[PDB]
Design a protein around this ligand. Structure first.
Ligand SMILES: Nc1ncnc2c1ncn2[C@@H]1O[C@H](COP(=O)(O)OP(=O)(O)NP(=O)(O)O)[C@@H](O)[C@H]1O
Ligand SMILES: [Ca+2]
Ligand SMILES: [Ca+2]
Lengths: 20, 337
């Protein structure tokens, strides 16, 4: 499932902002 | 009415924008208790103000690091804007000041923790629950955009839940005052509008895109565009193809197709009716916008609070002692702070 794939992924924790 | 409200709000903002407050407190007025969050230039700590005993969130930034990373403008923007705005769902800056080494921004402590933790904990929010928070963001961007402000970092990690279950928007690090187009590549990969990624130059509409991402994430439990790496994410974003969970209502899907719209002549928030396109959408039909603004609606979730200074709604971070040099650093760069 989409959820299972998200939850197994590397970006489920707090996400950092990015800039230039 | 809203017209009237917005024009007075703009007078109020412009006064403070034109003559920002400076140096209203000093470091030794506060006892530092615990880190609530960190970042590139420093950290955010729970602190207690000695003379009042009130708790605050103190954002601490290393001046030298800010200059090195070329983030002076963004940092000056953050403080200058945060000190001039006033709106029920924006966190309040209570004090600001600087010392030889650091910049300090002291805000009202919002104890409910990040929307992020509650969202991942519960998995996903019901549409009424998601809709209650989304309305807050809609009103907030209507306010901000009317002052020529773009927020540019909408995400659950930057939204705090207060003691009444209402949203407090924090982190004005990429907030900017601008009429027309701007070009900085900034935000959070999952939430970037296609026009940011394609380096076309962009405007306030990117905030409305980000809202669609946020409503999706709240309602689905996962973002509309995800992958293991940023690059992959940008591919899906520019692809623009979105799929919706089976449980999304027809109204929700229709609203999101209008927000997550690659075509700026068609994205909601960006048309002739402006925000009203959003406020009058079917998905928001049960929403009492005034009551929301007034905070008279019962919140779906009320954080547990084990008294003042409680940080159980925050993750733990490793601590480190705050250094202040006996040498002034970067004085000229931060004169206006
Ligand atoms: N007013 C506040 N009340 C309670 N907690 C807060 C407050 N402001 C910030 N925090 C916490 O501190 C974290 C970092 O604050 P933030 O303003 O986002 O700093 P940052 O240096 O820009 N780090 P980053 O997340 O990479 O942008 C937030 O996500 C919250 O968990
Ligand atoms: Ca942040
Ligand atoms: Ca930030």
């Amino acid at each position: 499932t989409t959820y299972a794939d998200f939850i197994a992924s590397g970006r489920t924790g707090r996400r950092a902002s990015i800039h230039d | 009415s809203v017209k009237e409200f917005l024009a007075k709000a703009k007078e109020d903002f412009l006064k403070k924008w034109e003559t920002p407050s400076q140096n209203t407190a000093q470091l030794d007025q506060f006892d530092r208790i615990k880190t609530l969050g960190t970042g590139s230039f420093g950290r955010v700590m729970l602190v207690k103000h000695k003379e009042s005993g009130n708790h605050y969130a103190m954002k601490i930034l290393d001046k030298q690091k800010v200059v090195k990373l070329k983030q002076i403008e963004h940092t000056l923007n953050e403080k200058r804007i945060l000190q001039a705005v006033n709106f029920p769902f924006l966190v309040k800056l209570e004090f600001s000041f600087k010392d030889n080494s650091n910049l300090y921004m002291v805000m009202e402590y919002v104890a409910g923790g990040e929307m992020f933790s509650h969202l991942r904990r519960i998995g996903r929010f019901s549409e009424p629950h998601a809709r209650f928070y989304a309305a807050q963001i809609v009103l907030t961007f209507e306010y901000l955009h009317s002052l020529d402000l773009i927020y540019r970092d909408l995400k659950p990690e930057n939204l705090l839940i207060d003691q009444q279950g209402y949203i407090q928007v924090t982190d004005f690090g990429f907030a900017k005052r601008v009429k027309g187009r701007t070009w900085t590549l900034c935000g959070t990969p999952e939430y970037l509008a296609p026009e940011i990624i394609l380096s076309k130059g962009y405007n306030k509409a990117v905030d409305w895109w980000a809202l669609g991402v946020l409503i999706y994430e709240m309602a689905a439990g996962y973002p509309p565009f995800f992958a293991d790496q940023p690059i992959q994410i940008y591919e899906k974003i520019v692809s623009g193809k979105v799929r919706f969970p089976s449980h999304f209502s027809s109204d929700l899907k229709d609203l999101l197709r209008n927000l997550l719209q690659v075509d700026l002549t068609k994205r909601f928030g960006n048309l002739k009716n402006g925000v009203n396109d959003i406020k009058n959408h079917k998905w928001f039909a049960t929403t009492d916008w005034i009551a929301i603004y007034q905070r008279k609606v019962e919140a779906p979730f009320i954080p547990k609070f084990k008294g003042p200074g409680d940080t159980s709604n925050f993750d733990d971070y490793e601590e480190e002692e705050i250094r202040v040099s006996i040498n002034e650093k970067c004085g000229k760069e931060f004169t206006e702070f």
